[PDB]
Symmetry: C4
Subunit: 300 residues, 4 copies
């Protein structure tokens, strides 16, 4: 049976975070705009996911103008608002950068690098990989690595597809250059993938679909900032209390086209401020968590 | 040859220098669609399904859907007047996104809107989806909307908003040549000149909104109540007003007669207006006034 | 030719001169549908899918859906009694929208409703969609609903509300001739005389609601808790009560036994009633009482 | 007409709860992770129900990796967080344990038994039984009983399928070894099933789909914990007031993968604390409610 339902069980390791933090926070900014479904991108259909058009369907072989425009908000305006927020609050980001999206807006990528944020690969295209053949999925991976290396000067050491298929994580681990991937939702702590060997260990840093602004546009989620703030506050409070004895981590997922809207950004800043008002909080990039785990908890 | 502008102003948006050196411009928009929606009586092949209390409704083929008609009639009979009274009471101007067929069917409300000084912007001839409409028919609808709105108001509309555009809609608007602006985008916090603009024919885009919009009261996972809507608008205002200490932007607030015209929802709208009015340096504008301002302050070059 | 009235009272609604010169009339409506819904046991082709905790439910063809049956049984076994106790405790009259088959299956609750002085209004023979039903069969259902409700209560119903009407429903109600009012519209804040009224046969319309209605607790957009519902009702009340300083209106509040009969939801309802009761000049009315009042104060011309 | 629309009518019995409680609370922890739809479990499709992927559909004949991962959260992390909560607050649980899920994580089953929680059968598989053949459903029931007996040392005395078919409850009563089942949503009190006899009475303890964390992932659902807390508080307040003269019960349904997330757990703890701040509250296992009803209100 190939699934690990057990994990650490009732005995998770103490992460011993920097500063003996009671909680580690990983803010993640997705950058997908310009890489989504679009006939202009070589796709058979328009995009339908994660936009204000909460009931949208993909349209075959045509452009959906409103949908394109909603995505353009993220790359034109939302991204800059959010970069300014993270700079103002002095909180690092891991950016889940879709390589095609990056290619179409190199100046924002440069700004992200300038501000010291990690550029993590979010795949070549922002599409569903469920049914993609292995050779083609591998080709996309290599191309994503190539593009991100050229744009930033350094290869990505993290990987996150999101809409994975049965081969995705295997291919990541086979490529061999990734310190971690985040294509799981299965824990409150990093862990070494069962496929790890002494020679090739691979760290998993689980991500999130719940403390994630994508829920502002899904059939169940949040309709305002107050609700999102309360949700994040609760997660923080529970984990921070656990961290009196057993610290964990919390990921916070963000999208430029979504929380980049001023109506939603207020709650994000309020949460950052709330977190910052507590001592023993570690605000980390995913790569930093990965390098910490290699040092503190090496694979055995 | 990639036709989408993902970059826009980048990290260097212009200072709009709003009237009164406002830190934020607010554009309240009242849609008037009731009487122009899908209905077999309007020549459509199906009943309306969108933007009503029947949040799970589907279009019914070739038949009248009585409850759906009735819900729309609320907007034209009662909701619209409640809202006009509110904006008069608070002394806040509207841009009305007027569907021409809807306007034809209730000329008295159009006259009242004009009397109160609100802009009448074209919201197309029919309140239907134009995604798949042939260019010839879309052009004829445009001309008819212009004709009707001119007759009813005495002046041609200078703005355009379809909503459910097709790949030709914005091109046709710019081709017609008589529109100062259109609002068929959701791509920025400021107006900008469309890439298709020329020295002889500049065309201004004033981005609209699907988020600070009462349509969300009837969409899946939408606002449960007015408090939530008020908080949503307040947050947008607060963030932008703070930005406006150095770099003012604008905010659109989208409204529908059959939706926020209900007393349960109108309370939050009035609360938001009062909240905004309690701040100095807020410019409450019609879209055409924003357009005129942009021509003067930031002419196309 | 256009058969819809988009205009209504326009900007000149009549002053209703409510009893006690009330600033607002409140109509609390309790639906009683449980035992009349879709079920193969009831002669239907499929199980029920609407208005239950299973928000994503679809009808199942030709079989029983046990969980769905059970959720409906909660309303007839437990929810209804909780609600009747609440309205007795607060001394607020109801109009009950009673489905005739549901009533047949629980005559004791009907008797209790009559004992407490609530109006029994017809909600049709079956709780099903009438959109596609042939006229003859719809008329048969109507006559049967009248017959059953007359037998159970001792008096024929004088009100009618199907909900899921078809294009013939309201015409048939008016043709029957024994109804003082119907509530199969969502088009106004006041009663009005149907355009089909004559001096000989006036017919009053008392518009109902899909927004201030607990059905929204189980729809894809609505409420997830009582606090939200309370605030929604409070806002509706506040806006209308303020309008009523000069132009009083009415508000309907729709309730279902299986929904707001759950203790988690009933708290908000009681809180709203108390809030309403804390204000002077509030008329808590049965729909029949509103209808009787309109006949006296605003007779058809 | 086979349905009982009438029940107790306006004359429900006084339950005379232990301690003359004004309300009985039944907290129920579902344990389903590892028994859901999965090709690895022999199913034809992947799971789609009750996860953060609030718009998911079953995928035919393939694995849906994100969906598997979200379920693994419940068995790896959420379950332990919740067991710690109930131990900390000293509140007993009835666990609706799916037999296959239990098989795959015997350590958590042992921890549940150690903590004194009831292990109730939640069926052999966590699948829809609407369209299951009668003989096959009977087979599953027998297997669920066998597995649960083996793991805990004692046969389950309670039964809850959830997604029943027209034969499920009949089969439970036919088996004859269940003190109660909870496959109804029809009352605020236990009652004897109409099929009961003097020789074989069968108690029904109605469950809930409203005071249930499944709503955090259903189309209309709670945005956040505060809303769930208020929902539960209102239920408690109304029933506690009724209980001045006519006490009833309230079920609170929980899932490891859902309320086991720290963002949602805060509200649950807040509610337990709120309840505990009132006198005359009986926190009960469903089996305890069943044994009480046999003593206080025997079938006649």
């Amino acid at each position: 049976y190939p699934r690990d339902l057990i994990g650490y069980g009732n005995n998770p390791p103490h992460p011993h975070w920097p500063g003996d933090a009671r909680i580690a926070l990983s803010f993640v900014l997705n950058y997908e705009e310009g890489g989504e479904r679009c006939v202009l991108h070589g796709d058979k259909e328009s995009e339908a996911f994660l936009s204000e058009m909460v009931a949208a369907q993909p349209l075959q072989g045509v452009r959906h103008m409103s949908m394109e425009s909603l995505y353009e908000y993220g790359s034109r305006a939302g991204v800059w608002r959010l970069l300014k927020l993270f700079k103002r609050r002095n909180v690092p980001l891991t950016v889940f950068a879709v390589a095609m999206a990056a290619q179409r807006n190199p100046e924002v990528i440069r700004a992200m690098v300038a501000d010291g944020h990690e550029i993590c690969s979010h795949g070549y295209r922002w599409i569903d990989y469920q049914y993609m053949d292995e050779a083609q999925e591998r080709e996309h991976m290599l191309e994503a690595i190539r593009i991100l290396t050229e744009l930033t000067g350094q290869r990505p050491v993290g990987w996150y597809t999101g809409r994975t298929g049965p081969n995705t994580r295997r291919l990541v681990m086979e490529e061999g250059g990734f310190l971690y991937d985040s294509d799981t939702y299965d824990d409150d702590l990093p862990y070494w993938d069962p496929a790890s060997t002494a020679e090739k260990p691979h760290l998993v840093i689980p991500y999130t679909l719940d403390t994630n602004d994508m829920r502002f546009t899904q059939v169940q989620g949040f309709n305002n900032g107050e609700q999102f703030f309360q949700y994040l506050k609760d997660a923080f409070d529970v984990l921070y209390e656990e961290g009196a004895t057993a610290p964990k981590m919390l990921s916070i997922g963000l999208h430029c086209r979504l929380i980049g809207r001023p109506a939603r950004m207020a709650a994000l800043e309020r949460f950052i401020q709330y977190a910052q008002s507590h001592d023993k909080v570690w605000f980390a990039r995913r790569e930093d968590i990965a390098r910490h785990w290699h040092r503190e908890h090496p694979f055995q």
